Amino acid sequence: AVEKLLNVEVPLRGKYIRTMFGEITRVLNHLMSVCSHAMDVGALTPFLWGFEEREKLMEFYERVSGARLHAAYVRPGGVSQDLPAGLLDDIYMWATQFGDRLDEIEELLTDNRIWKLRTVNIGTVTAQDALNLGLSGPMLRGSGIPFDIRKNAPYDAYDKVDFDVPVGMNGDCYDRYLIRMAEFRQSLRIIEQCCNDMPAGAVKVEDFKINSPPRNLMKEDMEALIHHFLLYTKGYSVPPGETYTAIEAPKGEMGVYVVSDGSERPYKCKIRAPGFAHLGAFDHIARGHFLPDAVAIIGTMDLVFGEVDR
Amino acid sequence: KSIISYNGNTIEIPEEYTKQAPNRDSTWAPAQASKTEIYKNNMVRFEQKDLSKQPMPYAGIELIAQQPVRFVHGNTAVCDGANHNGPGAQGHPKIFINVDAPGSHACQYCGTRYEKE
Amino acid sequence: LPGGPVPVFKKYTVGSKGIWEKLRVLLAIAPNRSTGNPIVPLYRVPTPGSRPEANVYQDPSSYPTNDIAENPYWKRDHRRAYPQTAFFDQKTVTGLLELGSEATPRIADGEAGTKALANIANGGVSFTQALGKSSKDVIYGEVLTVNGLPPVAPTLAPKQWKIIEGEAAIYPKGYPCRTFH
Amino acid sequence: SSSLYRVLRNAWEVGPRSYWKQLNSIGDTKSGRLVGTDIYGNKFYETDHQDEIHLRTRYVEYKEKDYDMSQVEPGWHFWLGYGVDTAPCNTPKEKLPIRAYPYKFQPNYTGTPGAFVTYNTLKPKISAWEPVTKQR
Amino acid sequence: ARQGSFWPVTFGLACCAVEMMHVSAPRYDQDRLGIIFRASPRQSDIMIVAGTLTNKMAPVLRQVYDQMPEPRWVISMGSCANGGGYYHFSYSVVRGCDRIVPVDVYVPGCPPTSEALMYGVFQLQRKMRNTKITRMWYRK
Amino acid sequence: MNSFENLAQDVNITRSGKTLIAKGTGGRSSRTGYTATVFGANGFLGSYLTAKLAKHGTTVVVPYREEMAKRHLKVTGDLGVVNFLEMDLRNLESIDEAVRHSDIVVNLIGREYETKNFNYYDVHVEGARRIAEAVKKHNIARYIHVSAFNAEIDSPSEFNHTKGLGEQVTKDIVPWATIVRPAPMFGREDKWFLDRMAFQETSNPVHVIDVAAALERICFDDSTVAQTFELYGPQKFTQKQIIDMVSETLPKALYQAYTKATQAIWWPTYSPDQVERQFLSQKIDPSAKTFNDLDLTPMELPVSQLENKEKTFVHIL
Amino acid sequence: GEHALRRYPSGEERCIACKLCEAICPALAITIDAEERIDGSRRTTKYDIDMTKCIYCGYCQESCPVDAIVETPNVEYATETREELLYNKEKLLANGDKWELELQYALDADAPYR
Amino acid sequence: VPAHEIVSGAPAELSRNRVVRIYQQAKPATQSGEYGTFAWRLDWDIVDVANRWENDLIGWQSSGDYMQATQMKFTSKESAIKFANKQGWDFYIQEPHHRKFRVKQYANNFVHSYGKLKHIRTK
Amino acid sequence: PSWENIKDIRLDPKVHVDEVYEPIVNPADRYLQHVSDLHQYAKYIMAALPKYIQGFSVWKDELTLHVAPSAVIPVTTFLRDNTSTQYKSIIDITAVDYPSRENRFEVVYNFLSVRHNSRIRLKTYATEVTPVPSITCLYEGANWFEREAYDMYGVFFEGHPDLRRIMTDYGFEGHPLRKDFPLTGYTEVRWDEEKRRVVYEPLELTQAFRNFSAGSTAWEPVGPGRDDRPDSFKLPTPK
Amino acid sequence: AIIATAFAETVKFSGSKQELQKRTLALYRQFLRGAPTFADLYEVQFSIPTIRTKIRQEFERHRFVDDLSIQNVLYAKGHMEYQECINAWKQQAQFLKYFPEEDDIQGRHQPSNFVDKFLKNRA
Ligand SMILES: NC(=O)C1=CN([C@@H]2O[C@H](COP(=O)(O)OP(=O)(O)OC[C@H]3O[C@@H](n4cnc5c(N)ncnc54)[C@H](OP(=O)(O)O)[C@@H]3O)[C@@H](O)[C@H]2O)C=CC1
Ligand code: SF4
Ligand code: SF4
Ligand code: SF4
Ligand SMILES: [Zn+2]
């Protein structure tokens, strides 16, 4: 959103690198929510196997940024800094085994008859009121509608990366489960295509009036010391305007509506969270279900509650 | 060392703890707050406590005064303050000091005094 | 089948050795499955604070930006070259319907065309009066499509779908989820 | 591995004295190399054995029976967590930082009466008047 | 017994809860320490405030703290749980659960590393070493 | 906004000579300037007392005996207000060290029952001896000493005897001690009261929030020095009267033999000098100053239609 | 992890009181007062971080031109009181003293990438 | 003028005790820029007890006044007045001060002295 | 066929460039044709509903219809139901206050046509007291959004079942996302030990909030910028 | 959310002053019918006529408001307050927001005159 307001373009390597770290974020999200759904329904081994793959990925986060859980890596000019020295050879070594670590989790749930009977006609949403409730992502594609943002309105080097999209047919919790189990596979396809097709070049945007010069430069260049001093006290200024920018989070379509005064503070920011519209839609679906099947439907709208209230 | 506790009570601390640091006893700023000042203000919460495991980390105003003065033969003296074993840009920004007046002119980032000879 | 099953000696995982592997190929569901544990001499050696690549690193750049002499910044600045929101009231759309356009000027009498501009800028004409005054092929040229149809809600890049249904799909037939590409 | 053979051969390599202390310290049985020791006194070990998982190669044997992660020396702490390859006795004269003062190593004194006290580094911002009278 | 069995009622309402679920993960295991989440305050020894505390939930956090049986401790996980944190200057936030519950160990970190949360647990077990429930009855 | 209600003013000087400028508005994040030491702040009175004391930002120094209980008084004050420090009454440097920076100090150390280490003579007249020694030593304005009602030395009751002995001791040592005698004390979950139960003695019960309020209202004006106060509720009560109020809200020798058997336990058993105090009743000094000295008045201790509407609901689906 | 104020070779405090770490901090954890000392050099009289409102973004370390404050990888410093968790100048100078051997290893591998 | 102070949720204390000031920000004597000198700022006068005090502990600037950091921008002066009496606030308004136009020539610097020079330019 | 004899990939010939070549181009140039398309589409919509559409703005790939409050239900109905529009999915609706205007709040509506893959915005206005009419008649997903716009801004939606507060304290007096409401608020919470409950008190901070907005630029930072209005949709200069 | 809550009302704005007076009196009746379930529900110290005098007092705060729209916004806020109180969503700690006066005496030294306001400079 700030890139669109600022009218700047991120470099090539900065696009591919945010495609890649937006897909291992997708793997981590689908991992956490699929195994959390399986735990509150009652299967508890996938919780722990998925959380070990989450440890394997959180180290990649700690290599890349500083902190494991909260990384300030993706910045409005681009990327915070360059990859460490040998990580591209490491995500490959991870992916080679994650391909089978996922089929293994798939086997005790996909054709488990208890897991089937618990979610087959639970949480059915018709395709016409999936639009009226404002549902998106895995809940809209659970109902048969072929829509996702990284194919329809593409951004950040998803043009350059080839993949397919899973879309369910009946509006239930089972097809919302199956499309996540397939989005795992598609994200792994992104990861290996992005490790193969990684280019060289700058990782931040080119100019030092919206993000900082490197510390090699600002310790000898007068211009760069001026720009470094001013981007941190005052900040850069954004041109006056308004934008609504929506991307596809793994929870669904997540957007931000930001109003820029022309100052260096946003005049207004608003987060459109997917899970807000998913939990607002809860009454419409959970009418006439039993009390245990009011719990399996929480685990398909995947409420993390950082989304729902802020 | 006995200091008056706002009431005529004198409280007693060892004199190794009334020094600003074990380098320098006196204070190096006009609003530096003497250790006798600090202990006079709040000793309600240094009770039952060891003064030994307080930090005591070694005032730099006298660690810079014992460094030798560098001598430059030219007119202007260059400074970055980097190391040259470290792979990267460390130290401060590179500044150029005029050495023309009598005496030693110090770097305003690091304090290393330079003199023309 | 480009991403199909690969055997487990290209998967970088500690696996097994000896006749215990001959036992676990008989006692398995799929024999080409890893054990999960990465190979210790391969996975993360050397440790990230000990890299020979860190002492050779220099900050990256593209050519027409890092260029020392020929670019000035005002040619490659685009934050100050932002476009503004084209705000159109109804009376400028009446002005576009009655006076014309810069592609299509229906204005002679330049000296009198300023005062012909003026009364619409004052609010002499109204907008439905402009829709009634205006020709039918200006209604079918600028307001509507040249065939007389309403313009469809525009999209930037249209997406034509192609359902993959053979065994290049992600689920075989019988599963209630389809690959859409 | 999770084997009995591994705990078997490691118990035989390390010996029964060291086995009882490693059983009273950790649950595992580990055979190391003694890369070096701490200024606090904490022996460190690296295991080259083939059936080890990632993040098990390096470990500490402490000194005290109440042990902390806080009791490890800083240069060793980065090594135990797999930051550096070369242990801080293995690194040469050029990496050791120049100092003009002694090193003393306080671990952590939380709950201990040697816990840290915060205070005001400077004096109150507005002065008051010293009372001076005058007989007219 | 109070150390080797160690049951963490969690009142964590945001992000630090996933960082707690990495203490349940197979890399940093907690059951190998004796830790299990009895998810009812009637049986948990201790509470973990792992996340923020808003003004809408401060009596709810107090009511969950009220129900636990008397040998009770609480550790404060995160920086939003001690002194407000990132959301310190906000209208709907409690500036740390120190105002609500009497907390024994503070684990700092905005995502306080699973390493560090376990270290705070070891610090709490060291506090359990010197509780002296029976020497105190001897009027030491 | 908030306001300093405990203070008459902003700028307060104490009699020792310390100048105290209170800062800000009232409430949690501001400071009055006083430093207070409340002995026995673990206690049933002292919890309410330093809750009311640390409410406005008075720095409260509490010496504790056990550290597991004291945690419930960290909530009451701002960050930096309450200061816990360990104390035994035996180690006299802990007593003269906890009172070293106090400009007011409160004792409440009094125990119902003798145990292996303390009789009533060492808790009530010798601990008060040592604390008043310290206040004697350290030039502390406003020593406040809390006692029992029925506190006289000619009493047969060893509790009442040694508490009168205790005030003898603290008038002996510090002439400027305020000395305060409250009535029976009713409050929330009190030890030998409402939860112990929910008879011809007559004594007044007083609510404990208003003895804490009255105590703090003593604490800050120096009209209150070298005067002894008795704090009794509005209306005089019989025990059978009290317990039958409680009832519709919701031989002596072998009874003493029974309490003999039941004291040898870790739970707080009934003291034998307590039935002794039951026959004694509330005779209060008329040459003392009660609640209306310090401007407060204490709180006093005191089928056919749903069947047919049920006939329209649904009960089996 | 926790914070540290480093020192130069031959012992000088590095903090030239430029207020950049205070100006950038997203949670307003830094507070600094600065005075000219006896040498005429510009130093902090008072440096302070509230670790209860710190969020570990690393902007304070990214911002400093001298590279005076850094983040040590210590996360094992969990406390029992809030007063212990307010780090003044002296605790952070003691930290930059203690962890300096380690921060050598960190900044030998980070400084090109910064 | 409709009285919105009862439906804003703001307390009565703010509308009855606090006086507020509308002002246009002065051009700084420091630098030659004039960009922050167009909007009309709305700003609360301080309370003398509640403004700021230094802490016991570290010396943090503590405050009980809560409108000390709030400041509004308006396009117009009549915008600020309409909003200020619409919310029911006591306001003072400060009139701006622009610079007097004086004609400058560069040839002013060296005009001919007929009598005493009475000045020596430098350039 | 072993994990002993697997190849390493750290010992490999890697990609190496002498020099990277990235051409520079304005990011707004890729939008222009579609922006022209958007202009034409909007000029149709204003011509189709002249009673209800006061204006429109096209910035760059984003259409905004400026519509009056009593005009919102006839417009949204059109946007839901015309075969050309089909803006089925409600996305996000909220308010923004400009305190310098007579009508303080503007209420923005975001819509997605998943058929034609297009977004639209609808802006109306509201004073603090006067309402906007609710579109929860048409969209069942809208009301929670309206309700959030109620609590943060105080904007009303007439004809709304269960308008009340959401994502704020129950006894909270005030509307937070509003320029007269201060950042830290009016009240704070603590545990009173005397009453054995939490009490709500007037606010007081141990460290006061320091905004560094005082100290912004004194030079105006960005120009006016250029236009991407097509030559089809601006007024002809005479002669 | 097509089904609404139990004690809901579709928010509707009155063009007449008197029909809003009708709705206001109906609302007062709902509040005072619900005073005993408020006393049982929130476990209060006191008795029901103090809830009833607070409901009457909170209505006599807003009696001489003229403008019909401000009375509409007031009526909507009041019905939302009733719906929160009757449905047991508010808790006792926020139910007792309404009674700051009743819980305790806050202490001595209530400043009334100029001088005892001056001695603590309004504190
Ligand atoms: N019926 C009543 O309640 C009456 C009470 N009083 C008197 O008021 C005072 C407090 O009463 P109350 O609050 O109700 O009951 P308490 O339970 O508070 O009395 C004991 C208090 O003093 C501490 N204490 C007792 N002995 C010692 C000791 N040797 N060393 C250190 N501390 C000790 C206790 O510590 P700890 O908390 O660890 O147990 C506790 O804090 C007493 O003096 C009592 O005689 C006056 C009239 C009647
Ligand atoms: S402490 Fe940090 S990670 Fe945890 S909930 Fe708060 S802000 Fe989120
Ligand atoms: S630590 Fe760095 S940013 Fe902070 S005042 Fe010192 S030099 Fe400036
Ligand atoms: S890490 Fe971030 S929050 Fe913490 S002091 Fe540095 S800039 Fe501030
Ligand atoms: Zn230098």
JSON list of N, CA and C in Angstrom, two decimals, chain H residues 4 9 31-35 52-53 61-64 66-70 79 82 87, chain I residues 99-100 102 104 128-129 173 180 182 186 203-209 211 218-220:
[
{"chain": "H", "resi": 4, "resn": "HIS", "atom": "N", "xyz": [-22.70, 19.65, 20.99]},
{"chain": "H", "resi": 4, "resn": "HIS", "atom": "CA", "xyz": [-22.31, 18.26, 20.80]},
{"chain": "H", "resi": 4, "resn": "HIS", "atom": "C", "xyz": [-21.49, 17.70, 21.96]},
{"chain": "H", "resi": 9, "resn": "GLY", "atom": "N", "xyz": [-18.99, 11.91, 24.45]},
{"chain": "H", "resi": 9, "resn": "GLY", "atom": "CA", "xyz": [-18.36, 11.06, 25.42]},
{"chain": "H", "resi": 9, "resn": "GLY", "atom": "C", "xyz": [-17.26, 11.71, 26.22]},
{"chain": "H", "resi": 31, "resn": "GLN", "atom": "N", "xyz": [14.95, 28.22, 10.20]},
{"chain": "H", "resi": 31, "resn": "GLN", "atom": "CA", "xyz": [15.11, 27.92, 8.79]},
{"chain": "H", "resi": 31, "resn": "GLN", "atom": "C", "xyz": [14.10, 28.69, 7.95]},
{"chain": "H", "resi": 32, "resn": "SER", "atom": "N", "xyz": [14.33, 28.70, 6.64]},
{"chain": "H", "resi": 32, "resn": "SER", "atom": "CA", "xyz": [13.61, 29.54, 5.72]},
{"chain": "H", "resi": 32, "resn": "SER", "atom": "C", "xyz": [12.35, 28.89, 5.17]},
{"chain": "H", "resi": 33, "resn": "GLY", "atom": "N", "xyz": [11.93, 27.78, 5.74]},
{"chain": "H", "resi": 33, "resn": "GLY", "atom": "CA", "xyz": [10.74, 27.11, 5.26]},
{"chain": "H", "resi": 33, "resn": "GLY", "atom": "C", "xyz": [9.49, 27.59, 5.95]},
{"chain": "H", "resi": 34, "resn": "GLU", "atom": "N", "xyz": [8.37, 27.50, 5.23]},
{"chain": "H", "resi": 34, "resn": "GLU", "atom": "CA", "xyz": [7.11, 28.07, 5.69]},
{"chain": "H", "resi": 34, "resn": "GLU", "atom": "C", "xyz": [5.96, 27.07, 5.58]},
{"chain": "H", "resi": 35, "resn": "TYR", "atom": "N", "xyz": [6.26, 25.77, 5.52]},
{"chain": "H", "resi": 35, "resn": "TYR", "atom": "CA", "xyz": [5.22, 24.81, 5.18]},
{"chain": "H", "resi": 35, "resn": "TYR", "atom": "C", "xyz": [4.30, 24.51, 6.35]},
{"chain": "H", "resi": 52, "resn": "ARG", "atom": "N", "xyz": [3.25, 18.54, 34.27]},
{"chain": "H", "resi": 52, "resn": "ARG", "atom": "CA", "xyz": [4.35, 17.59, 34.26]},
{"chain": "H", "resi": 52, "resn": "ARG", "atom": "C", "xyz": [5.11, 17.65, 35.58]},
{"chain": "H", "resi": 53, "resn": "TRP", "atom": "N", "xyz": [5.61, 16.49, 36.01]},
{"chain": "H", "resi": 53, "resn": "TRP", "atom": "CA", "xyz": [6.52, 16.42, 37.14]},
{"chain": "H", "resi": 53, "resn": "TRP", "atom": "C", "xyz": [7.49, 15.27, 36.94]},
{"chain": "H", "resi": 61, "resn": "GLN", "atom": "N", "xyz": [9.39, 12.15, 32.87]},
{"chain": "H", "resi": 61, "resn": "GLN", "atom": "CA", "xyz": [8.40, 13.22, 32.90]},
{"chain": "H", "resi": 61, "resn": "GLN", "atom": "C", "xyz": [7.03, 12.58, 32.97]},
{"chain": "H", "resi": 62, "resn": "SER", "atom": "N", "xyz": [6.43, 12.60, 34.16]},
{"chain": "H", "resi": 62, "resn": "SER", "atom": "CA", "xyz": [5.10, 12.06, 34.40]},
{"chain": "H", "resi": 62, "resn": "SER", "atom": "C", "xyz": [4.06, 13.16, 34.27]},
{"chain": "H", "resi": 63, "resn": "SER", "atom": "N", "xyz": [2.85, 12.80, 33.89]},
{"chain": "H", "resi": 63, "resn": "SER", "atom": "CA", "xyz": [1.81, 13.80, 33.69]},
{"chain": "H", "resi": 63, "resn": "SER", "atom": "C", "xyz": [0.44, 13.24, 34.04]},
{"chain": "H", "resi": 64, "resn": "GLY", "atom": "N", "xyz": [-0.43, 14.12, 34.51]},
{"chain": "H", "resi": 64, "resn": "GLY", "atom": "CA", "xyz": [-1.82, 13.79, 34.75]},
{"chain": "H", "resi": 64, "resn": "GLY", "atom": "C", "xyz": [-2.73, 14.50, 33.77]},
{"chain": "H", "resi": 66, "resn": "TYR", "atom": "N", "xyz": [-3.96, 14.98, 30.17]},
{"chain": "H", "resi": 66, "resn": "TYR", "atom": "CA", "xyz": [-4.01, 14.02, 29.08]},
{"chain": "H", "resi": 66, "resn": "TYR", "atom": "C", "xyz": [-4.21, 14.66, 27.71]},
{"chain": "H", "resi": 67, "resn": "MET", "atom": "N", "xyz": [-4.60, 15.93, 27.65]},
{"chain": "H", "resi": 67, "resn": "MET", "atom": "CA", "xyz": [-4.69, 16.64, 26.38]},
{"chain": "H", "resi": 67, "resn": "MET", "atom": "C", "xyz": [-3.40, 17.36, 26.03]},
{"chain": "H", "resi": 68, "resn": "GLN", "atom": "N", "xyz": [-2.28, 16.99, 26.66]},
{"chain": "H", "resi": 68, "resn": "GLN", "atom": "CA", "xyz": [-1.04, 17.73, 26.44]},
{"chain": "H", "resi": 68, "resn": "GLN", "atom": "C", "xyz": [-0.40, 17.41, 25.10]},
{"chain": "H", "resi": 69, "resn": "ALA", "atom": "N", "xyz": [-0.67, 16.23, 24.56]},
{"chain": "H", "resi": 69, "resn": "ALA", "atom": "CA", "xyz": [-0.08, 15.83, 23.29]},
{"chain": "H", "resi": 69, "resn": "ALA", "atom": "C", "xyz": [-1.05, 15.92, 22.13]},
{"chain": "H", "resi": 70, "resn": "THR", "atom": "N", "xyz": [-2.34, 16.07, 22.41]},
{"chain": "H", "resi": 70, "resn": "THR", "atom": "CA", "xyz": [-3.32, 16.23, 21.35]},
{"chain": "H", "resi": 70, "resn": "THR", "atom": "C", "xyz": [-3.21, 17.62, 20.75]},
{"chain": "H", "resi": 79, "resn": "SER", "atom": "N", "xyz": [-13.23, 27.31, 10.34]},
{"chain": "H", "resi": 79, "resn": "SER", "atom": "CA", "xyz": [-13.34, 25.88, 10.63]},
{"chain": "H", "resi": 79, "resn": "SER", "atom": "C", "xyz": [-13.01, 25.58, 12.08]},
{"chain": "H", "resi": 82, "resn": "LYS", "atom": "N", "xyz": [-15.73, 27.12, 14.41]},
{"chain": "H", "resi": 82, "resn": "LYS", "atom": "CA", "xyz": [-16.98, 26.37, 14.33]},
{"chain": "H", "resi": 82, "resn": "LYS", "atom": "C", "xyz": [-16.88, 25.04, 15.07]},
{"chain": "H", "resi": 87, "resn": "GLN", "atom": "N", "xyz": [-18.11, 21.95, 19.92]},
{"chain": "H", "resi": 87, "resn": "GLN", "atom": "CA", "xyz": [-17.80, 21.04, 21.01]},
{"chain": "H", "resi": 87, "resn": "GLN", "atom": "C", "xyz": [-17.94, 21.69, 22.37]},
{"chain": "I", "resi": 99, "resn": "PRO", "atom": "N", "xyz": [-12.16, 17.12, 10.64]},
{"chain": "I", "resi": 99, "resn": "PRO", "atom": "CA", "xyz": [-12.86, 18.06, 11.52]},
{"chain": "I", "resi": 99, "resn": "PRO", "atom": "C", "xyz": [-13.02, 19.46, 10.94]},
{"chain": "I", "resi": 100, "resn": "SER", "atom": "N", "xyz": [-12.35, 19.78, 9.83]},
{"chain": "I", "resi": 100, "resn": "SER", "atom": "CA", "xyz": [-12.48, 21.09, 9.23]},
{"chain": "I", "resi": 100, "resn": "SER", "atom": "C", "xyz": [-13.69, 21.21, 8.32]},
{"chain": "I", "resi": 102, "resn": "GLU", "atom": "N", "xyz": [-17.92, 20.81, 7.50]},
{"chain": "I", "resi": 102, "resn": "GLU", "atom": "CA", "xyz": [-19.21, 20.87, 8.19]},
{"chain": "I", "resi": 102, "resn": "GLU", "atom": "C", "xyz": [-19.71, 19.48, 8.52]},
{"chain": "I", "resi": 104, "resn": "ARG", "atom": "N", "xyz": [-18.63, 16.08, 9.26]},
{"chain": "I", "resi": 104, "resn": "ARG", "atom": "CA", "xyz": [-17.32, 15.76, 9.81]},
{"chain": "I", "resi": 104, "resn": "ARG", "atom": "C", "xyz": [-16.77, 14.46, 9.25]},
{"chain": "I", "resi": 128, "resn": "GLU", "atom": "N", "xyz": [-21.72, 14.05, 12.99]},
{"chain": "I", "resi": 128, "resn": "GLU", "atom": "CA", "xyz": [-21.76, 13.39, 14.29]},
{"chain": "I", "resi": 128, "resn": "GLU", "atom": "C", "xyz": [-23.16, 12.99, 14.75]},
{"chain": "I", "resi": 129, "resn": "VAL", "atom": "N", "xyz": [-24.17, 13.78, 14.38]},
{"chain": "I", "resi": 129, "resn": "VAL", "atom": "CA", "xyz": [-25.55, 13.56, 14.81]},
{"chain": "I", "resi": 129, "resn": "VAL", "atom": "C", "xyz": [-26.40, 12.95, 13.70]},
{"chain": "I", "resi": 173, "resn": "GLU", "atom": "N", "xyz": [-17.15, 5.41, 27.55]},
{"chain": "I", "resi": 173, "resn": "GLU", "atom": "CA", "xyz": [-17.76, 6.63, 27.03]},
{"chain": "I", "resi": 173, "resn": "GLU", "atom": "C", "xyz": [-16.73, 7.34, 26.17]},
{"chain": "I", "resi": 180, "resn": "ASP", "atom": "N", "xyz": [-10.62, 14.53, 18.35]},
{"chain": "I", "resi": 180, "resn": "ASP", "atom": "CA", "xyz": [-10.69, 15.16, 19.66]},
{"chain": "I", "resi": 180, "resn": "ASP", "atom": "C", "xyz": [-10.41, 14.20, 20.80]},
{"chain": "I", "resi": 182, "resn": "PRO", "atom": "N", "xyz": [-8.11, 11.89, 22.87]},
{"chain": "I", "resi": 182, "resn": "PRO", "atom": "CA", "xyz": [-6.66, 11.80, 23.02]},
{"chain": "I", "resi": 182, "resn": "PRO", "atom": "C", "xyz": [-6.18, 10.37, 22.86]},
{"chain": "I", "resi": 186, "resn": "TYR", "atom": "N", "xyz": [-9.08, 8.78, 28.56]},
{"chain": "I", "resi": 186, "resn": "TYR", "atom": "CA", "xyz": [-9.54, 9.50, 29.74]},
{"chain": "I", "resi": 186, "resn": "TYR", "atom": "C", "xyz": [-9.36, 8.73, 31.03]},
{"chain": "I", "resi": 203, "resn": "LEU", "atom": "N", "xyz": [-7.07, 9.33, 34.24]},
{"chain": "I", "resi": 203, "resn": "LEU", "atom": "CA", "xyz": [-5.82, 8.78, 33.73]},
{"chain": "I", "resi": 203, "resn": "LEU", "atom": "C", "xyz": [-4.62, 9.55, 34.25]},
{"chain": "I", "resi": 204, "resn": "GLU", "atom": "N", "xyz": [-3.54, 8.81, 34.48]},
{"chain": "I", "resi": 204, "resn": "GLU", "atom": "CA", "xyz": [-2.29, 9.39, 34.95]},
{"chain": "I", "resi": 204, "resn": "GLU", "atom": "C", "xyz": [-1.17, 8.45, 34.54]},
{"chain": "I", "resi": 205, "resn": "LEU", "atom": "N", "xyz": [-0.09, 9.01, 34.00]},
{"chain": "I", "resi": 205, "resn": "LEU", "atom": "CA", "xyz": [0.98, 8.23, 33.41]},
{"chain": "I", "resi": 205, "resn": "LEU", "atom": "C", "xyz": [2.28, 8.44, 34.16]},
{"chain": "I", "resi": 206, "resn": "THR", "atom": "N", "xyz": [3.08, 7.38, 34.24]},
{"chain": "I", "resi": 206, "resn": "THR", "atom": "CA", "xyz": [4.39, 7.49, 34.86]},
{"chain": "I", "resi": 206, "resn": "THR", "atom": "C", "xyz": [5.39, 8.09, 33.88]},
{"chain": "I", "resi": 207, "resn": "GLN", "atom": "N", "xyz": [5.22, 7.85, 32.59]},
{"chain": "I", "resi": 207, "resn": "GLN", "atom": "CA", "xyz": [5.92, 8.61, 31.57]},
{"chain": "I", "resi": 207, "resn": "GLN", "atom": "C", "xyz": [4.90, 9.21, 30.63]},
{"chain": "I", "resi": 208, "resn": "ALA", "atom": "N", "xyz": [4.96, 10.53, 30.45]},
{"chain": "I", "resi": 208, "resn": "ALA", "atom": "CA", "xyz": [4.03, 11.21, 29.58]},
{"chain": "I", "resi": 208, "resn": "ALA", "atom": "C", "xyz": [4.34, 10.90, 28.12]},
{"chain": "I", "resi": 209, "resn": "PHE", "atom": "N", "xyz": [3.30, 10.92, 27.30]},
{"chain": "I", "resi": 209, "resn": "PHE", "atom": "CA", "xyz": [3.47, 10.65, 25.88]},
{"chain": "I", "resi": 209, "resn": "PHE", "atom": "C", "xyz": [4.19, 11.81, 25.22]},
{"chain": "I", "resi": 211, "resn": "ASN", "atom": "N", "xyz": [5.03, 13.16, 21.61]},
{"chain": "I", "resi": 211, "resn": "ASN", "atom": "CA", "xyz": [4.95, 13.05, 20.17]},
{"chain": "I", "resi": 211, "resn": "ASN", "atom": "C", "xyz": [6.03, 13.88, 19.51]},
{"chain": "I", "resi": 218, "resn": "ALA", "atom": "N", "xyz": [9.78, 21.73, 7.23]},
{"chain": "I", "resi": 218, "resn": "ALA", "atom": "CA", "xyz": [9.34, 23.08, 6.93]},
{"chain": "I", "resi": 218, "resn": "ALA", "atom": "C", "xyz": [9.40, 23.38, 5.44]},
{"chain": "I", "resi": 219, "resn": "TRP", "atom": "N", "xyz": [9.95, 22.48, 4.65]},
{"chain": "I", "resi": 219, "resn": "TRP", "atom": "CA", "xyz": [9.90, 22.54, 3.20]},
{"chain": "I", "resi": 219, "resn": "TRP", "atom": "C", "xyz": [8.89, 21.51, 2.72]},
{"chain": "I", "resi": 220, "resn": "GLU", "atom": "N", "xyz": [8.09, 21.90, 1.74]},
{"chain": "I", "resi": 220, "resn": "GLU", "atom": "CA", "xyz": [7.01, 21.05, 1.26]},
{"chain": "I", "resi": 220, "resn": "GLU", "atom": "C", "xyz": [7.63, 19.91, 0.46]}
]
